[PDB]
Design a protein around this ligand. Sequence first.
Ligand code: MG
Ligand code: MG
Lengths: 219, 219
Amino acid sequence: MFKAVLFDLNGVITDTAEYHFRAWKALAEEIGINGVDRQFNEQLKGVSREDSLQKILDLADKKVSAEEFKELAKRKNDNYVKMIQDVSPADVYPGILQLLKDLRSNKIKIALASASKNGPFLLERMNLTGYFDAIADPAEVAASKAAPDIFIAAAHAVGVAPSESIGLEDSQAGIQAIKDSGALPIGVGRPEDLGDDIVIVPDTSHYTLEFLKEVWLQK
Amino acid sequence: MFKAVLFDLNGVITDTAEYHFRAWKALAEEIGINGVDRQFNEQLKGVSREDSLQKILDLADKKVSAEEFKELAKRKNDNYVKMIQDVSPADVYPGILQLLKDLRSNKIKIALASASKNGPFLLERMNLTGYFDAIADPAEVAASKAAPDIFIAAAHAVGVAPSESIGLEDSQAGIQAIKDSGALPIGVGRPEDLGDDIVIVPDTSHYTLEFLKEVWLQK
Ligand SMILES: [Mg+2]
Ligand SMILES: [Mg+2]
């Protein structure tokens, strides 16, 4: 039986994308650029803050100094950080609390493997910290977004190999990173997005302990 | 108040997209071409049967005669048609049957505005024919994505202007078609996909007569 579950945060435990979006939208309006809507925002997902800022600026062909560019990027983060003060337990995705409980009951290790620089904060705000055996620190891994490194780190940090673990991810880069680590991916979303070769569920309510076991047995 | 509701079929009333995919995949295997998966399938949505085959031929730089091209296109459609023989009333999406009943009870016209060449057949199999005042024939109109023609035809066939109507769609091109027709769109899906400028519900169980009336009043 698998010995640990390695969780990404956004798209699995809760929604942080919503707040990245509002933070960029707030910035954009604030310097009076139009066009930063939910469709536009797709061009910002999985993309660096600087490339994200550049794309926004290009909407208005706006010009900036190096100093203004620095200040805008910092201001986006300040916004994001204000907007996540809102996070609570009511923001936890369905099935997730109950999965963490049943994992903890069965002495399966639980680690976070997220790029979020606000991981620990977000977990405390959602009242989830007590379930987590480790949180991989993205600053100590410093790897690129499809790299296995964060998953390896999260596994190692709870004293297991990635081959003893399942990873949960809503993104194709994430799924690829779990695969590269050696762990077994189970996706959440649409097969059109993630691929036909892994177990995908439609929403997080399907991530149950019993489901996770059956998947493990059947690989 | 709006006087007609113009329905897309696939993604609104039921799923036919899955059958299209299975038949293309079955054909691709038969001719020994790999890479016909759900993700590649996204590139066949809203594409003619012939253009779809070509995109599949192009995965392996495969060539065929004009005669065999026609044969492959035919076999795929036949298999599709065999596969939809199983469509039933149980395959109607949540909320739709009740919405149809309520529209009819309130003497609001109901038309099909679908590209499906099997629309009448599909509504007979789902036992929906009774609710529909008209079905726009896609053989008699334009096959451009996001062309308003099918929506215009549907409205006209129930004796309304498009400006008197609501259109239900789950794809961006379909939303654009509704807009262009003059009708008011209500999307089903994600704003990331459909746009932020229209009302979108997350699934079809939100498509209620009360909801449609509220959208109409606020437009
Ligand atoms: Mg994610
Ligand atoms: Mg559709």
